[PDB]
Amino acid sequence: VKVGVNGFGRIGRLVTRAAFNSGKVDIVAINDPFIDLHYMVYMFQYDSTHGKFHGTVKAENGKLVINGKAITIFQERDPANIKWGDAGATYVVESTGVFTTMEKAGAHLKGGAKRVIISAPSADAPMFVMGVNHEKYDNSLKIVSNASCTTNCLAPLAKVIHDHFGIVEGLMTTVHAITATQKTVDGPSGKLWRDGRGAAQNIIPASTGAAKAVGKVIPELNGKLTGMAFRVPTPNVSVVDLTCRLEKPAKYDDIKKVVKQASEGPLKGILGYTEDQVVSCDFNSDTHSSTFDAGAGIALNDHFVKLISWYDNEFGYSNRVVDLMVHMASKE
Amino acid sequence: VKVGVNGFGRIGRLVTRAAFNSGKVDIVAINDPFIDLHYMVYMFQYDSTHGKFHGTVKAENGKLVINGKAITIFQERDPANIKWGDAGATYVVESTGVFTTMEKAGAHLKGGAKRVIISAPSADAPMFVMGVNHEKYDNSLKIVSNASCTTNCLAPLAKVIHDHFGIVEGLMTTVHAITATQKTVDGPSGKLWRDGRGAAQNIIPASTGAAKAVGKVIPELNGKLTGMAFRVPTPNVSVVDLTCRLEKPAKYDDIKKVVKQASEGPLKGILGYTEDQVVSCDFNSDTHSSTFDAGAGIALNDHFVKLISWYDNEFGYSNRVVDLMVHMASKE
Amino acid sequence: VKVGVNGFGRIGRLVTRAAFNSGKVDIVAINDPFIDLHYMVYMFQYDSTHGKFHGTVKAENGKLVINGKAITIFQERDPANIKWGDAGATYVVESTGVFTTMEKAGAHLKGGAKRVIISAPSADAPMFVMGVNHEKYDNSLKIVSNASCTTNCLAPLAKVIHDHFGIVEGLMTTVHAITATQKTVDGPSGKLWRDGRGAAQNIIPASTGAAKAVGKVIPELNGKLTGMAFRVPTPNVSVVDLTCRLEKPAKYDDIKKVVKQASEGPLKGILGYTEDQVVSCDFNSDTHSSTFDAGAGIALNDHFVKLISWYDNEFGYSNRVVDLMVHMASKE
Amino acid sequence: VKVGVNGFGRIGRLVTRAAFNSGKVDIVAINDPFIDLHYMVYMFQYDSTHGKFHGTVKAENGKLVINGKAITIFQERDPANIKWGDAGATYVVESTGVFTTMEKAGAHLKGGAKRVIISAPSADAPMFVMGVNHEKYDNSLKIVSNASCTTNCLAPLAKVIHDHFGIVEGLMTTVHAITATQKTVDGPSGKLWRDGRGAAQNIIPASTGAAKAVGKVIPELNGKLTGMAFRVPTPNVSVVDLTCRLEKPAKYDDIKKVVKQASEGPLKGILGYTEDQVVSCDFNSDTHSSTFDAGAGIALNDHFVKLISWYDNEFGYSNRVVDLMVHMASKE
Ligand SMILES: NC(=O)c1ccc[n+]([C@@H]2O[C@H](COP(=O)([O-])OP(=O)(O)OC[C@H]3O[C@@H](n4cnc5c(N)ncnc54)[C@H](O)[C@@H]3O)[C@@H](O)[C@H]2O)c1
Ligand SMILES: NC(=O)c1ccc[n+]([C@@H]2O[C@H](COP(=O)([O-])OP(=O)(O)OC[C@H]3O[C@@H](n4cnc5c(N)ncnc54)[C@H](O)[C@@H]3O)[C@@H](O)[C@H]2O)c1
Ligand SMILES: NC(=O)c1ccc[n+]([C@@H]2O[C@H](COP(=O)([O-])OP(=O)(O)OC[C@H]3O[C@@H](n4cnc5c(N)ncnc54)[C@H](O)[C@@H]3O)[C@@H](O)[C@H]2O)c1
Ligand SMILES: NC(=O)c1ccc[n+]([C@@H]2O[C@H](COP(=O)([O-])OP(=O)(O)OC[C@H]3O[C@@H](n4cnc5c(N)ncnc54)[C@H](O)[C@@H]3O)[C@@H](O)[C@H]2O)c1
Ligand SMILES: c1cnc2c(c1)ccc1cccnc12
Ligand SMILES: c1cnc2c(c1)ccc1cccnc12
Ligand SMILES: c1cnc2c(c1)ccc1cccnc12
Ligand SMILES: c1cnc2c(c1)ccc1cccnc12
Fold first, then answer.
1. Cβ-defined contact of C42 to B282 (cutoff 8 Å)
2. Which part of chain D has CATH 3.30.360.10?
3. Which of A47, C95, C110, C124 would give a disulfide with C11, using CB separation of 3.0 to 4.6 Å?
4. Residue A281 bears catalytic tag
5. Which H/E stretch holds residue D161?
6. Candidates A21, A327, A328: which one to mutate for ligand 6, based on the most atoms within 8 Å of Cβ?
């Protein structure tokens, strides 16, 4: 399926690498009014976090050419003005952070795009998490959301746990790497005042919709989970800390057994499982949505447990965006 | 009371500062075989985290003279060889990190100390938290513990919440600054493998006895709390995240009022209360044991809540060591 | 003199603090369209780097009241629309970073300011360094620059060394803390590609005009000095490394004596001198422009030496802005 | 050639990976009294900086088995007691940091080792830098030094520059990643007081022998270079900043031309060359000893220049150790 990328950022650029790396998505157009063509070459080829592109990248005849494939480059602030159709972009990855409502994201349809995948939670577009509810997608849906990085780590763990023991209620904290929304030194950050404080210096409490959004992705959990985040001074890789109360009793070893099972079978590639003495860097460029850390968790009793799961918030999510598009493409 | 300090490290130095900032306590001797007299002048004067000492520090006549007061300096590896009695050290703060059992900390009694306060949890020395169970101290105790930084954070809060609502069960996480036991790059840590991984690079899961220890300090909570830690790349200040289930219903505003009431009366100076948009650096050099962050916590319902509390692990704890000694002295 | 501040950022806030810590200067107005009145109360009160403000800050009656003094608050993007005259702002500190030419900074003259001090180098506004060429200021200058933090570090030192030994030629590097222009993760920086790379992850080469600018401030050194920068993952405090060739022979002890003599007389408060085993944090909130580090430099021979000098880029510079205004006012 | 590794640290473990990766060195014995066998598995397989070993690692029948090759594991504090000969270890990589003199390093010969390669500068063992003076090695030399990471970055650049233009004199600064000798928080560090200050917080001035040691590796430069270091808060990758005065005039483009030439021909794989807008992370796991950064340098005039060269201090040096051993092996 051919695809356009709106906003060539962390997710835009890594969705582009994941795309090249799958057989199944062809990136044909990129719009980013803040990154010109020769600058796009540089930002793609060099990556502080995930390392140099293993691949070829250049500018040629006004097009970005990756691994010999030529890509139409647009420079539009208003997505309503992007000539996607002409470019041959069937689906658009809305990865700017700034067009997340159906109405705003729907502007890509005016340039002749067929479907939009918003790389974030949406107030009103339907949200999908691969492995959890993607099969609820149907062809009527022109504008969809891939949810967040955090919702993609929480939801698969929660699916497995609810399915086997019943989640009565749960409260989630994510300890999360810094992102591009944050500031290098104490600076302005709108109505979210904590988010402006110096990102390298501080542990920063923040809001997250992800626990509530899981109750959308798994309706039986509606209103049973909420949570929060702490931003901390690492450049990538985040961890979910789920504290939950269960209906059926669950010894820790039975939780481990059932998560290992799921990681090996129907959630292979999405939910991982480890008992190794891992730290955050051990997941850098790991493509899973969620990896259970057996050693790090702790149970108070058979009904009350704290479960820990790792995620590369850039790289895992990026791969999920590709996967959703493949799934959508195959339903057309 | 005259005090000697064993281990002139982060805690030993900051206890010394806190002692001089308050005449609460007179420092008369210090032992550290890895820091000579001239070198102590340097390490006490300049502090990366808390700034340059406001006062005078020099070497005269083989002693360390802080604010005009001469301190006897020892250089012994074996605590049994330190002549505390000769120097007048009545109470000894045991802040090396390697003598935390009664048997080992007791060696100070050999050199003529009268009582020992271990600046960490102990497998067997009784543990005290100022404002929670410090009145359980009595003069029959020659060797006591001031518990851990984390316990001093969690306990005052857990007391208020338990006293007023009844904690049925709780799971804790502390997102904690790096300490001297950690490593600059991947290196040997012995039995605790994750802890040897590069401190500036990683989110590192780690073990903590604080939640259990709360059940000693608050006997009604015995066996009702457990937890874990994440070490993250900050140099100081940490945060407790307590997820608890309550017996009696408590609306979040009722929790706020109760906690604020507690900060203003009996736990004043120990448990603080804030509604501001704070981040970790706002607690650097803050002397509270625990500061409840109203805005950062979140309730799922009237019986299931996540409560957030900040602590300067270095500075709050060091002030508590002095306060505990002052109390002890009053009981003599 | 009454002062208005345009851009209530790292420098604008710290100038404000320095003004209140010294009555040197009265702050009467502040403009920042990205920080409302209530939000200013927050950002001024809490500072990750320099700590909580010691004094009072609140909003009353649409003004910002610091230490009892009410300050008029504007929210204009266009400096021409700020009514400085109505608020009584005689001098305007232009600390936004986006109005550094005479033509742009001059727009403050439209709203009724009398003179403008740009808190950065200027392509055309004359530049002054306290203790080096501030007596070249005269009342014919409506728009002046206080140069850069780096220039304020390099110039006092280069003056002493030149005055006494004759700098034939020099090459400078500054190893410099991160600033607000940098990015938390790899992102767009426009024309300056290295600067958009993740600030907490990298050693980043960067351009600096400081060495050349020294040749304006010290006309005899015109064309005799150039340099570069490395941005590194600290939040504050930077260091000059000046490698120079000398005309007259200077033994390193002669250099030390000359510099120390300079710190004790005419450049006292501007150029500091130390022999202690200092590191960057020992200069956090230090008001000097430049602190010579005797121990850290090294001579190849009597004519070829590497000289090291520390500066708090935020705090030293901010104090210099106030000092420059006080001087200006004395000349009126 | 079969080899033993004394000290399985950063360099010990990466020399081991580089060894597997060449065809030509077989690691057969490892001694490290602080890392037991199952711990060795973990420390080899997981690397925060260079990523998971792409390879197999396990413990079997009391031996460390990497990629099917079994390795004898010793646990001796005194290298005089290590049974290398029995193990079949012909050469030993002395990578503990603690046996760097001929006499101390010579203890490995008592256990039947034939030659020792000390992974650091030595006060008295002869030092080699591949590409610069390795051909001065002869079979009489049983104990040698591979110099330092910094000497390996400086010396190839200096060779090329001296060869073409004449280095009259030079002064070098290295801006260097933290290492395992440094401390996570302000702590003791012997007679080198700065080195104990908190490594994540500070820019730290330090000593280096590397500029002087280049005058050993290139005798014509004896007494013509010296320098210093700054340690800064990155976990790996360092940069040399060489300020030098030249005999023959050299336009910057002629310097670039001659370094590019050398990187392409006789210093291929040792000295690299780039004009890209690179930052430190772009060299992570780069095997060169030295990569010239054309864009980052700056010339004052044709005789006085500042040259910049990057190095992965762990990975580049590690590969050089292997290379030296191959060279030594082929001269036997
Ligand atoms: N970083 C993560 O870990 C992560 C994970 C999952 C989802 N997301 C979400 O993805 C979105 C992007 O996140 P990111 O981290 O890549 O941000 P980023 O800041 O790195 O990238 C955003 C890009 O959008 C471009 N842009 C801005 N306005 C534009 C416009 N009008 N038209 C075209 N391009 C424009 C910017 O120039 C930039 O290159 C956000 O909604 C974020 O919440 C982020
Ligand atoms: N840093 C914190 O946040 C914190 C807070 C609460 C409690 N603690 C506890 O306090 C203790 C000290 O921790 P720290 O962070 O100050 O560590 P540290 O490493 O900064 O200080 C320990 C000091 O003890 C010295 N020492 C080692 N062996 C010695 C001996 N045989 N005799 C005398 N001195 C010796 C070392 O030279 C060092 O100066 C530990 O038990 C720790 O768990 C630490
Ligand atoms: N941080 C330092 O080390 C340092 C030292 C010396 C000089 N400087 C210089 O001082 C200036 C400010 O740097 P800073 O570090 O404080 O940056 P900053 O980003 O912290 O502050 C700039 C402030 O200006 C505001 N602003 C942006 N557009 C505006 C407008 N149209 N009108 C009014 N305000 C506006 C922003 O909201 C922000 O509060 C820059 O020129 C910088 O080069 C910085
Ligand atoms: N890290 C760098 O970038 C770098 C580069 C070039 C050279 N070097 C040099 O290499 C040497 C090691 O450096 P490193 O960074 O790997 O240090 P490291 O601390 O990571 O490794 C040292 C290892 O030696 C072991 N060890 C200590 N005493 C021992 C003994 N008596 N017998 C056996 N093993 C023992 C330790 O347990 C540890 O695993 C030093 O001389 C250093 O100067 C380091
Ligand atoms: C045209 C282009 N791409 C596709 C299809 C048709 C049909 C199915 C499909 C499934 C996965 C990925 N791409 C496609
Ligand atoms: C587990 C892992 N991968 C997948 C699924 C479940 C479901 C659908 C799908 C579609 C495309 C690519 N991967 C997956
Ligand atoms: C035995 C073992 N290894 C070797 C030799 C003999 C001879 C030469 C040589 C050259 C490079 C690497 N290894 C060897
Ligand atoms: C440039 C690059 N690699 C080398 C040399 C010079 C010289 C010797 C040598 C021996 C073994 C492996 N590599 C090299």
1. no
2. 147-313
3. C95
4. no
5. helix D149-165
6. A327
